Amino acid sequence: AQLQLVESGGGLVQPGGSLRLSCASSGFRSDYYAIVWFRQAPGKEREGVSCISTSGKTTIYADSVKGRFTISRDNAKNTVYLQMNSLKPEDTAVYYCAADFRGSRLSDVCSYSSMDYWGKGTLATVS
Template structure:
């Protein structure tokens, strides 16, 4: 589990039954895009994808991970989900969720 506390905003990420969950508290999740990032052992950070929260459909994935990851959300419980299909050993990493504004494609401001 990873907990990021920035001022009064909290993002909690945990893994249950094949799905990573990112619970947002302290603000409305529809105010920000939620980005997913992972860090494999001994490696740098790798952006995996993002969802424009509240849209349910505006999702972008890293090219190398298209078809392997699926992002969904439940706005009623302020939670976003990352499902990894066909989990492989190379998917072993610490996964993070981060709230950010996207000003233009590729920019992440947290």
């Protein structure tokens, strides 16, 4: 039941701009995993940014990113999109997408916890 997560869309952007990160999951039951976007910056530990549940109707965002980041899921394309608006210089980091096996497609709960699979990560920096 191995799952492969590929992150794309990262790159340079100006302050106050808009960015989109796509995490594509390929596997047996990719539509059974809650998708969590973490970020890691040089000089600080990994922290979660935004988690989307398997059902997709429950989304949680970090306090520093609440109101600016929006997470959405497309099971037909098997990809989770994270849209960042009004990016700040403190957001210069590498973003990883991770899959947590929820055991249910209709799961309404997701949180930053022991993730089964991790993505390579994309460098998203603003200057």
